[PDB]
Write a protein that binds this ligand. Structure first.
Ligand SMILES: [Ca+2]
Ligand SMILES: [Ca+2]
Ligand SMILES: [Ca+2]
Ligand SMILES: [Ca+2]
Ligand SMILES: [Ca+2]
Ligand SMILES: [Ca+2]
Ligand SMILES: [Ca+2]
Ligand SMILES: [Ca+2]
Ligand SMILES: [Ca+2]
Ligand SMILES: [Ca+2]
Ligand SMILES: [Ca+2]
Ligand SMILES: [Ca+2]
Ligand SMILES: [Zn+2]
Ligand SMILES: [Zn+2]
Ligand SMILES: [Zn+2]
Ligand SMILES: [Zn+2]
Lengths: 203, 181, 203, 181, 203, 203, 181, 181
């Protein structure tokens, strides 16, 4: 949380030191080159962020503070790469530096929440400066989602058209006789061979 | 959450492969875990001419070993390592466990009927020969008369295995598809 | 669309594999070095964006997902250069990463729509989180355009003054006896020689 | 949309030239295609003392070969390659097709009258000698008495060509301007 | 203005070429290596912007389109450096790329106008998409300035305190017996020697 | 303040020079390589800002204008590094370039004030263009803080849960028998040995 | 505000150490100084099972030498240099001054009672043996019967020092903890 | 607006010096030109204990050679080059032209009175000896009895020059201050 004043607290223990009656424990080795002057690079979609490693270690149980970060390290470039939004990542990093999370009013609440979930940040850590703003925006977006749950038909027609287009693309591939498309069509042909049935064109 | 090093020493994937798998998994599931409904939503969009919900449920139950109701990245890569990187017997055990719904140790005709119903649901309702409404039944019959050897009305792991090694097409299918990727 | 779980689906086919009655198709070669660890650079007006190539391949029929991208590649610098707005390009790239398009409320709707058209994105792919905002802003800007169609006179006077200035600049070039200006004046002189008529100063 | 490699093998432009042309074309037309009205708006701002709309219509019809009502980048570079990089006979055929409005195979006096009206519309209504309202007519007369050789009241491609090679000024104009750029 | 379709217009002249009666002018040399593939760098307060040189040449009479730009070139780094605001410079550059100027609603109108004046852009070139927004904001800021002209006393007290502090700093320098401060105090001492009078402390 | 016109004022002294009766002082040495063409780099969380050193020297008594800046210099990379927010730092730097501070309406007032305090900028230097906006936002945030002073219970429960979790983590460390955690637990064990008392699990 | 060079020549820290200390100090106190309340808020979060407010007040008074009511970075590193980098006698003088609340030059039993009350307040109200409500009193008694040598009812700096060097455990505690960091 | 190369060949400043001067000039005057009021506002903040408005007006009139009411960067660097880089006679001519308000070719006592009033206005109303309200008058008297040689009640350029070279302090002032910068 606050590792910067930890040496101060350890020094302040000197007021305890003489009045103690009995021995003292063994101090930790702490042989890790003091974990200082690191300045690691977090490359978020091409935007370079730089931070001290201890700053990230302030908050474990999050992505950047834990060993989960190792999943995004690139030893070739000696940097972590994230295929995420850099503008919201600015607030993500500011949280580690200060401890409080700010909500930018100009960003979509859904994008902000997705970035919070990706990096392991809980929305309850948003500071009181921004919490009312965030809560109001989240309420409007929940209201929209519930109103949809209980103009959607454009989305439904679009997704059905997308599935029809995928089926027609596979049928045209069959008629002819894009790596993803080739592997997906191979999987569909395997399904055909499994069921001994073949698809047919919808029109 | 298991670390990259522990997943490296547990699964058969390299560090790069695990990193790519985690990248994709978190791109679809930012929380790092997936529930049955989101799993179905992910799996359905590979089958735009059918209903994969039942087979997706079977897959979700098979992958989620600790029965938490959630498939984590650990469940994900454990299953993917058993299937894509395991031996032919490992894959055959995984498939047999998929078919054995109650996990008791045998495959009944109704268990296989559920599996073939799920598989044929992907074919869609508008196919070439017909939607005979009985093709899964006779496919189960063919599967049993091929796999079962003592004709006891059930399939055991021994019969499943030995019948599988006695089918060259099954070998071709195992070696080619689950090793190219 | 979702190429990340394609290996999962191909593995899941193992439940089909034993119960199939009959042979199986030939698996694809897929000999393209797995198309992994690319991390291509999209230089938008000096701002470096980095992304995986498969992320862009998720959405063909757009500029970045198609071979149209090749028109902007710079082999000397090994990067794609776009003389476009980088702030809006952030949302363009976020679409490829997530599949949904967000609309930034602080940007002009005309600039946003021009960037969408340039990169081949259709406004109907804007997510429901931002669609009402986008629709309202587009409605106001359509209302302005229609009110103009049916304070414009300042624009008309400015454009007429610009044409008069261009004509006067060509006349002054003739009197004297900026590569673009020289070639344009050569074209105008060619027009003169074609018609055997000459321009004269408007004042 | 034709790719960069296919346009390289079809046109006579290099990869760099095609990239620059595409950059400019998309800077003016982000959608990648241009309609007649946007084409007129683009073309007009090179002629700030006249009306280029009719000549722009002729150009749009000549460039848009498949008569889709839209000039794509393929139409654009095909026409630009024929004019800027083709032989003198290729340019002469392109110009003859521009003049032959009905594309029947001959140029009548009224067809040429439309062309010269379009050209003189760029001169503007405020020029040096006069707006005689008959200069296009007598210019058509001069063009016919220079180009036509059998005096049949029409211009054919043979007469157009041979009369063109019999004019040194036309050669100078072809070689210089359409090859410097 | 539009140099991209200039080769198209020069090619279109081929319809004039045969029907001309008389000779043709001499085509321009245009021997400047086609002025292509430049990709000049505009460094604005550390933010790299990259653009084609012809894009900037589209609009002379502005700073970036004219030879005034040469005052900001750094031959050592082969880039132009501007000690200006990069966020507003994004819109400045977008003007060259498109021809229209957009007004960002989230920026101060005074800062925007100062950046427009610095780079030689006239506010009347703002597109109709943003012109009403810009005009309204400029009206509010004019209203504030006029209300001040006809809470200012805090500013007046601050500036008087600043002058008193400068005078006291010079007096303390005299008592003692920061290059700018030293040269300024030398100038004040020269003024003293000119008038044969000396300053004294105000308190 | 304005060192750019200081040579102009020194030159203008030539009107004083002949009419003076008496000698003149000794001009300053000013032997510091003219302090020109520096272009120092301020790295703020990975974002490079570049500025002239004299621009920063315009305003001493602030962090960037004083020797306090030296606490953030990295001789290895030859740059100053700040683990702060770069977007607000843009306005911080704009203050040095112009003398006036602008307030971005889209940023949290608390974050802005914290960045102002860190870099030694006083909120009274905000220009009149932005002062009313800033004052209104600060008034709302003061109103929130006072309403809290006189939904907080969620914060109180969270902080109590955090302290309980820290105590339980230390107890679990004791049961077992993360450098910060190890040193902190060592300090707590030292406190135990000082008081001859031991902690016990709260549940 | 003292500069980096002056703090280097005053304290015993290197340039890098002073830079890291300033970085942390300003990260917690952006204004560059800390008052008693913010100091307590900083210090409390190292003791999540007790009340450190009284001991924090003692520390704040000891560190803030010029009695401005504010601890600046200069106060901070001066105290940290005396404790972490000073000799054993320097640390012992610092601790004695911490105990001597009135700074008169001696430690009374009530002064030590305040110190041990502050220290035991960190132990919390829920500890292993008991909250005897008298442990600080008898701990003061033990401290006096160990430190005081003339049994005058007070502790002087001479007795404090010599009794400290006569306790090997105190030496181990001084050398180990305040020199590892 | 004169270019960098033309200003290099006109003034005596190098490319770097002209670039720095332009940087500062545009930082204060983004439009590239400065009017009399903005000029006064710029010049005043070098004199925080007086009123420099009248002397600033004299400077603005002297620098703005073409009497456009605006000082451009060309006016700025032309004047700065004459003063800072010119010979002693060039500076003396510039100062004489500053004093000669009507530019007729001579300095009268009232012209010098205006100049000394402007100069003493910078001293402020609260100075050491006194605000005698007559010090400019007697300073003009001293200046005339030093500069004028034929005692005609006026100062000519010849007398100004020769009297200036006959004062060593004036030489020291010219060489030192206007050449160090
Ligand atoms: Ca699981
Ligand atoms: Ca069973
Ligand atoms: Ca059996
Ligand atoms: Ca076409
Ligand atoms: Ca015809
Ligand atoms: Ca004929
Ligand atoms: Ca203090
Ligand atoms: Ca005492
Ligand atoms: Ca004693
Ligand atoms: Ca002038
Ligand atoms: Ca006179
Ligand atoms: Ca005289
Ligand atoms: Zn906030
Ligand atoms: Zn959204
Ligand atoms: Zn706009
Ligand atoms: Zn402002």
């Amino acid at each position: 949380g606050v590792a910067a004043w930890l040496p101060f607290a350890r020094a302040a223990a000197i007021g305890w030191m003489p009045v103690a009656s009995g021995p003292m424990p063994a101090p930790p080795r702490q042989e890790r080159k003091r974990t200082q002057d690191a300045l690691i690079v977090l490359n978020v979609s091409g935007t370079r962020f730089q931070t001290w490693q201890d700053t990230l270690e302030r908050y474990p149980d999050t992505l950047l503070g834990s060993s989960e970060r190792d999943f995004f390290y690139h030893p070739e470039t000696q940097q972590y790469f994230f295929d995420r939004d850099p503008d919201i990542f600015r607030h993500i990093l500011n949280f580690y530096r200060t401890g409080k999370l700010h909500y930018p009013r100009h960003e979509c609440i859904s994008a902000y929440d997705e970035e919070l979930a990706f990096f392991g940040l809980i929305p309850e850590i948003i500071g009181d400066c921004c919490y009312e703003e965030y809560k109001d925006r989240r309420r409007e977006n929940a209201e929209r989602l519930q109103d949809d749950a209980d103009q959607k038909k454009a989305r439904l027609a679009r997704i059905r058209a997308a599935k029809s287009g995928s089926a027609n693309a596979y049928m045209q591939s069959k008629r002819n006789g894009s790596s993803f498309e080739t592997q997906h069509h191979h999987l569909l042909h395997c399904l055909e061979k499994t069921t001994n049935h073949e698809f047919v064109d919808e029109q | 959450p298991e670390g990259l090093e522990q997943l490296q020493e547990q699964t058969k994937f390299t560090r790069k492969e695990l990193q790519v798998l985690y990248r994709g998994f978190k791109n679809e599931c930012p929380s790092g875990i997936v529930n049955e409904e989101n799993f179905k939503q992910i799996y359905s969009q590979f089958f735009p001419q059918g209903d994969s919900s039942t087979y997706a449920t079977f897959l979700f139950n098979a992958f989620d070993t600790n029965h938490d109701g959630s498939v984590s990245f650990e469940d994900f890569v454990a299953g993917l390592s058993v299937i894509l990187r395991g031996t032919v017997d490992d894959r055959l055990n995984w498939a047999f466990n998929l078919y054995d719904l109650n996990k008791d140790g045998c495959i009944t005709k109704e268990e296989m009927l559920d599996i073939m119903k799920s598989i044929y649901d992907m074919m869609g309702k508008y196919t070439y020969p017909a939607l005979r409404e009985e093709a899964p039944r006779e496919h189960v019959e063919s599967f049993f008369q091929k796999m079962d050897r003592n004709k006891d009305g059930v399939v055991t792991i021994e019969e499943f295995i030995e019948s599988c090694q006695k089918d060259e097409n099954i070998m071709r299918s195992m070696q080619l598809f689950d090793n190219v990727i």
